[PDB]
Design a protein around this ligand. Structure first.
Ligand SMILES: [Zn+2]
Length: 587
């Protein structure tokens, strides 16, 4: 029961399957039908089935008694929590083997985005998609929303004729689809998308679903993913899910992607045209092992997820693209970790983070990913890949479709590494790594030559105050451009213009570029890139591409006001998960 946030008494009862009978109503913006949990009881004496819910409407609850008869049981729907929602206590027959809840979700459901046909690319049909991480599955599924509880699911979804349903299971149009996931997964991984979707594959087990405009552009961009999976299997074990597809969501998607088994939800912001932001997909394919195959039991073990997924993400990048692309990305990333540790509370920089009773979304940083990566990179360098990678492979094989907590990871990390090959790493470096704030100083600090030739170059003194701009720009990769803009000095102000007029980083195609540019601009007061930044902020709603922009922007009361004026235009359209965040950084 290492886990607040769940009213679910997963102590005595545990659901092993979920049959969903739902109807997708776009006018009422609600899914309505029923959830049929199949349970496994541990205690011989009577106990209630406690389930998590949110802005769910309950019609009736049934359970199967000692004689398989669907009898009506009664429930209590507790007062709504601000973060956990309303606890549903259903009074179930001693050992009820099943329970059927009849409900609907409401449009205020926090785990679902209802996009009007106009907020879509087709402009003709609306679009729906889920995001159930961390604790939003309950907003449209009465269940034990806990990463500690894994269930298989089958689901009968009803939609309109001329709309397609997708989920994180096997899809065998008409408007009557039924999906099946025979693989036990925690709820945050139950996902659904409905819209005017088209499908093209790329390989034998990889394809894409999208709105046509981005379809072929997307298939041209991730046609490497098959490679990700073959190189990834080589070192990490088999891809136990069968198929791996990509679901491009509309520009409104708040994140960069969700690792929904068999169907990763990807932001359109990565279809750049040059394959530069592709580590995102290598990153979502990494979850297949960390955070999907083996999942954190609570949200304080969230690093066992992002950490390892970030580490494996890079490896897959080295294997298919080469270690120079690979460490060019570890550096670029470690620079932000350092920047975040600085703006962060010296309590959140810990790996086994304390949530303090916060929202699993509020309490969220880059820490567990990069610091959890440097951590495993530390054990790599310490033991070697042979030994480290054999261990990591067993680690995934041994926890196949299981849950794990920080304390136990340690027990295993010791019994299978740190103690297997003794006297290399001490339990002080282990404890220090996962429990203490900031970085250990002896923490790997990936360094990229190419980057660092640039470092030397950024030294064109006061400005064209040694060297012209006849640098190797015409050879600069996306990575090499973010490093330039990134450690370029914040004292260029206007001084800045050669830069934009020569390379035009303002109207820069790649979004990452546009980002780092406006970030630096507003910092140095390059006040010139405010209009382009406006459309940018109004257009895209990915958090990690507007959030930090709204932060720096909202730190000069005169500037912080320009924010509210635009955030009042871009506000509608953003995903709730984003609005929420920007709503706080904008006072
Ligand atoms: Zn992730």
């Amino acid at each position: 029961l290492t886990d607040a946030y769940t009213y679910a008494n997963y102590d005595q009862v545990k659901a092993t399957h979920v049959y969903l009978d739902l109807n997708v109503d776009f006018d009422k913006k609600s899914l309505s039908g029923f959830a049929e949990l199949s349970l496994d009881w541990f205690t011989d004496n009577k106990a209630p089935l406690i389930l998590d819910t949110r802005d769910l409407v309950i019609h009736r609850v049934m359970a199967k008694n000692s004689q398989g008869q669907w009898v009506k049981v009664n429930y209590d729907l507790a007062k709504r929590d601000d973060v956990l929602g309303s606890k549903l206590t259903i009074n179930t027959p001693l050992n009820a083997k099943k329970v059927r809840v009849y409900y609907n979700s409401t449009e205020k459901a926090t785990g679902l985005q209802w996009l009007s046909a106009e907020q879509t690319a087709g402009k003709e049909k609306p679009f729906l998609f889920s995001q159930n991480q961390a604790i939003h599955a309950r907003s449209w599924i009465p269940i034990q929303d806990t990463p500690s509880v894994r269930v298989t699911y089958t689901a009968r979804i009803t939609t309109d004729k001329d709309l397609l349903a997708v989920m994180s299971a096997n899809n065998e149009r008409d408007g009557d689809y039924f999906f099946s996931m025979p693989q036990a997964i925690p709820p945050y991984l139950i996902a659904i998308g409905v819209g005017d979707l088209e499908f093209k594959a790329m390989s034998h087990q990889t394809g894409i679903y999208a709105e046509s405009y981005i379809l072929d552009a997307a298939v041209a961009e991730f046609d490497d993913t098959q490679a990700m999976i073959d190189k990834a299997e080589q070192m990490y074990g088999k891809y136990r899910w069968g198929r791996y597809d990509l679901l491009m969501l509309p520009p409104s998607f708040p994140f960069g992607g969700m690792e929904n088994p068999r169907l990763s939800f990807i932001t359109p912001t990565v279809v750049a045209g040059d394959k530069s932001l592709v580590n995102l997909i290598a990153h979502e394919l990494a979850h297949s092992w960390s955070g999907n195959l083996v999942t954190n039991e609570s949200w304080r073990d969230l690093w066992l997820n992002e950490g390892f997924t970030s580490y494996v993400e890079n490896r897959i990048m080295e294997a298919v693209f080469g270690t120079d692309r690979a460490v060019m990305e570890q550096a670029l990333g470690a620079q932000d970790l350092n920047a975040e540790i600085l703006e962060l509370d010296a309590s959140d920089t810990q790996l086994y983070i304390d949530l303090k009773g916060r929202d699993p979304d509020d309490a969220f940083s880059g820490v567990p990913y990069v610091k959890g990566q440097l951590f495993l990179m530390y054990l790599e360098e310490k033991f070697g890949r042979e030994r480290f990678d054999a261990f990591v492979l067993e680690y995934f094989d041994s926890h196949a479709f299981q849950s794990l907590g920080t304390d136990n990871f340690v027990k295993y990390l010791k019994a299978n590494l740190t103690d297997k090959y003794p006297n290399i790493v001490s339990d002080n470096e282990i404890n220090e790594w996962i429990f203490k704030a900031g970085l250990p100083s002896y923490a790997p600090q990936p360094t990229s030559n190419a980057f660092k030739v640039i470092d030397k170059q950024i030294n064109q003194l006061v400005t064209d105050e040694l060297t012209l701009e006849q640098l190797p720009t015409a050879q600069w990769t996306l990575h090499e451009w973010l490093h330039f803009i990134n450690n370029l000095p914040v004292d260029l102000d206007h001084q800045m213009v050669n830069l934009d007029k020569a390379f035009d980083l303002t109207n820069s195609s790649n979004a990452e570029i546009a980002h780092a540019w406006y970030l630096l601009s507003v910092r140095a007061d390059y006040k010139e890139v405010y209009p382009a930044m406006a459309k940018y902020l109004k257009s895209i709603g990915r958090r990690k591409l507007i959030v930090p922009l709204y932060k720096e922007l909202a730190k000069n009361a005169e500037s912080k006001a320009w924010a509210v004026e635009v955030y009042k235009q871009a506000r509608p359209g953003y995903h709730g998960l984003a609005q929420g965040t920007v709503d706080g950084v904008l006072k």
